[PDB]
Amino acid sequence: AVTESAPNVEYHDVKGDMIQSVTTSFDDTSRLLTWTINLTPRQVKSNLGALVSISGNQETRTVTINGKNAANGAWNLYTGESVNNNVLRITTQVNDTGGEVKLGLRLVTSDKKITKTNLPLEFSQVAATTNGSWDKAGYNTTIVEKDTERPVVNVPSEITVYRGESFEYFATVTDNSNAFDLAKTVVRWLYSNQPGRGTEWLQYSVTQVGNQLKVRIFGNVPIDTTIGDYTRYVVATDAAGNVNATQTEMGNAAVDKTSVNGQFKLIIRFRIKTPENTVFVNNPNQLTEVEKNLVREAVKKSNPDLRAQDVLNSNYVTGITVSNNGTTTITYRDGRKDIIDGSKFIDTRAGS
Ligand SMILES: [K+]
Ligand code: NA
């Protein structure tokens, strides 16, 4: 991008009679800065001289006067043609640090060739030296540092969602520049910029809050989706185009089974629903085998969406286990477990 503005005027000698306006143009890719100075000397004459000083974070690349390269004669002299509505353009390479950049000028016109020795630094000395128009001014502006640092995503290691339920999580994006490319900030699986096979219901949105992005990760999980886990990525881009994780890094991480910044495991779990009818037993803390089986059957009945394929080895008897004290362990097809206390649905028939 190119940014154009009018710099801060540090001083402009009120006896000066040349400078009308000064503008800057900065290319954020080349980091070249052009100072454009428009001149209307009262005495145009034949020769323009420009004594130029720049801050140490700049290095001069080009100086033109009236559209032609200036002859190169802390302060350096450049000379060229003198016309009305003359344009002096000083292009510098800004260093990677950027920051405050400064320009100082002492300008003259003359009918004679101009030399640095015979160049007046005050209005009162003009008549005996260059004997034409004169001006003196200083400017500054501020240039961003070159941003070579990637943005950082903060997202949980695991985002756990439940079949039949909605979810909402946030990832946060921070960058050293405090500026982003929202269009190139996404949540995706590895292969393409999409939510991914099996998780097509994964949604996201990107908002900027202050100096950070907030990436809302949300959706509605179907009752009929596969239980297990999926690797997904928050990929964020700063305003300079640096990304937290590149496509090639995502691919290496997928093969090596390592992590990149912004990676998360999306885990789809089952949400166990409690029996609506109390399971009556003799001693809720010392169940018989028949009572353990009543507990398993009640859990199956209240969870008709828990299919055999959803539990370990597609077997309800080994996938739903019930301890002596009525604790139910459900082990799913992915090896994940729920350990569920029976206190809220198992009761004694004594006193019922
Ligand atoms: K950055
Ligand atoms: Na933006």
Author numbering: 246 to 318, 326 to 604
Show passages lifted from the paper.
The serine-rich repeat (SRR) glycoproteins of Gram-positive bacteria are an expanding family of microbial adhesins and virulence factors. Three of the SRR proteins (GspB of Streptococcus gordonii strain M99, Hsa of S. gordonii strain Challis, and SrpA of Streptococcus sanguinis strain SK36) bind human platelets through their interaction with glycocalicin, which is the carbohydrate-rich extracellular portion of the platelet membrane glycoprotein GPIbα. Binding of these SRR adhesins to platelets is a high affinity process, with the interaction between GspB and glycocalicin having a KD of 2.38×10−8 M and appears to be a major factor in the pathogenesis of infective endocarditis, since the loss of GspB or Hsa expression results in a marked reduction in virulence.
Here, we report the high-resolution crystal structure of GspBBR, both alone and in complex with the disaccharide α-2,3-sialyl (1-thioethyl)galactose, a precursor to synthetically-produced sialyl-T antigen. Our analysis of the structure further identified that GspBBR contains an unusually modular fold, prompting us to re-analyze the sequences of the SRR family of adhesins. A comparison of the structure of GspBBR determined with and without the disaccharide did not show significant structural changes localized within the binding pocket, which suggests that it is pre-formed. We determined that other structurally uncharacterized SRR adhesins also contain modules within their binding regions, suggesting that particular subdomains may be included, removed, or interchanged, manifesting in the broad range of binding partners observed in the family. Importantly, the structure of GspBBR provides insight into the binding repertoire of other SRR proteins, and specifically highlights which modules mediate binding to host carbohydrate receptors.
